[PDB]
Amino acid sequence: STGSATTTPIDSLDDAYITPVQIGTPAQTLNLDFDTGSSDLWVFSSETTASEVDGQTIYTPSKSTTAKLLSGATWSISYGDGSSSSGDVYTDTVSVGGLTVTGQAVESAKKVSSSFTEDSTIDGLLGLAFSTLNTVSPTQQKTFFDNAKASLDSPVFTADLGYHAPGTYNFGFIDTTAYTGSITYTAVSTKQGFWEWTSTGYAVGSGTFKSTSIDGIADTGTTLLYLPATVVSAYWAQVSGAKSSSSVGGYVFPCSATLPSFTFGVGSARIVIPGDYIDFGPISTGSSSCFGGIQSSAGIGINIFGDVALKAAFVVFNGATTPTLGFASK
Ligand SMILES: N=C1N[C@H]2[C@H](CS[C@H]2CCCCC(=O)O)N1
């Protein structure tokens, strides 16, 4: 089997991407944030505290003939940005882009934090990291991908995120028309439950490539590119007037600037992030200070290749017995 679904930016800045997912019988379609940095499939639901729902589409298990309470199971998750959610669990049929999993754990939110409530466009998350991070207790549950894997033509999924445009998540096949040149594969460590890999270095603009190992995670659920302070300082030093602002919460730059590109290494290959991808616009409406898309990972504890980086590439998440990650230009 295979699946193929379009993923669409939630706003004009590509802050996140939503992908329609069919849950239950008859289908209830919810727009979920596919997140390779976490491992829970959770949704706004008929059980979500009413005051914490503001425009989201909800899953109502009582209207699904295939829903079953997973008795005794609860879940609770906190993300790197401080947001959180929690609730109980149903199993139901879940389909993505024509690919169907029966008996998928669908985690029903009883509570969500303010940032979820305030984002009317995201109806929940679909985790695509390793199932060892799944938060369901007392019986940990498998991700959609892990459940689907045996049925897939090939045990892979791919992320092809657009810049200010829709893109695609495919399951079970590699679309050889979706990228240019060749795909370069690189080793993955699953020790922390993430798609964790080591970049071979970076360049700023037309500058020389610096060979240096940068361990980090391929994370579709994070907007920005978070890298060591040394790397980030070198980038922003090439932008007149750029500075790190503790009050704003990272690097800002004059909106009048033209940003340089940023290149990261994948083995001997190079992925170039155009400068415009690094512009996240005015810090507040009407401001001439703009927020940068490359930020320091100091204090996060891990480097994160978020959407800013991933949308510059066609990315293969290879879930074979020994997982690997592939990157191609496009
Ligand atoms: N600023 C927000 N944070 C949460 C809501 C909707 S997106 C969500 C954060 C998802 C993080 C995923 C992850 O860190 O792996 N708004």
- Do 175-330 and 5-174 have the same topology in CATH? yes
Structural domain boundaries of the chain? Answer: 5-174, 175-330
Query: What amino acid occupies position 106?
Result: V
Rounded Cα–Cα distance for residues 60 and 46 (Å): 5
Q: Which CATH class is domain 5-174?
A: mainly beta
CATH 3.40.640.10 fits 175-330, yes or no: no
Method: X-ray
Give residue 209 CA to ligand 1 midpoint distance, Å.
Answer: 32
H or E segment to which residue 148 belongs? helix 144-148
HSE of 240 in the Cβ direction (CA atoms, 13 Å)?
3
3-state helix, strand, coil in the chain (%, to 5): 10, 45, 45
Mutate to test the pocket of ligand 1, among 18, 78, 83 (most ligand atoms within 8 A of CB): 83
For residue 259, the 8-state DSSP code is P
| 207 Cβ neighbours under 8 A, 6+ residues apart | 238
In angstroms, what is the resolution? 1.2
Number of H helices, E strands in the chain: 4, 24
Give residue 125 CA to ligand 1 midpoint distance, Å.
Answer: 9
Give residue 79 CA to ligand 1 midpoint distance, Å.
Answer: 7
* Strand-strand pairing, 294-296 and 225-227: parallel
- Residue with the smallest CA separation from ligand 1 atom 6 is 116
Q: Is 242 exposed, middle or buried (0-12, 13-18, 19+ CB in 10 A)?
A: buried
Question: How many whole angstroms from its chain centre is CA 243?
Answer: 27
Please report the atom of ligand 1 found closest to the CA of residue 35: 15
